[PDB]
């Protein structure tokens, strides 16, 4: 019973941690941002 309760509490903590911390998924947002930069730069170079 203790093990099940600790597990359930930890899962709730995972949801609260991800919900309340905007930076938790930064690695994936960084990948998206790098691809967005690469394409915005490639298009902007056409104006040179």
């Amino acid at each position: 019973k203790l093990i099940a309760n600790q597990f359930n509490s930890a899962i709730g903590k995972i949801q609260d941690s991800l919900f309340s911390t905007p930076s938790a998924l930064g690695k994936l947002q960084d990948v998206v941002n790098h691809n967005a930069q690469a394409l915005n730069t490639l298009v902007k170079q056409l104006s040179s």
Binding site: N40, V43, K44, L46, S47
Partner: protein, 48 residues
Amino acid sequence: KCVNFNFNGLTGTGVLTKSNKKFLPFQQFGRDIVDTTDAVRDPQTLEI
């Protein structure tokens, strides 16, 4: 329709539609985030 156009010397190809952009009486052209022309004012009717 997809047409060729020449607007006061501006040459290009595209599909022209009614604009909902709010240009000031002074402004004649619009550009998006990447400095690509995306709006003109008709030289005879002043339609955007």
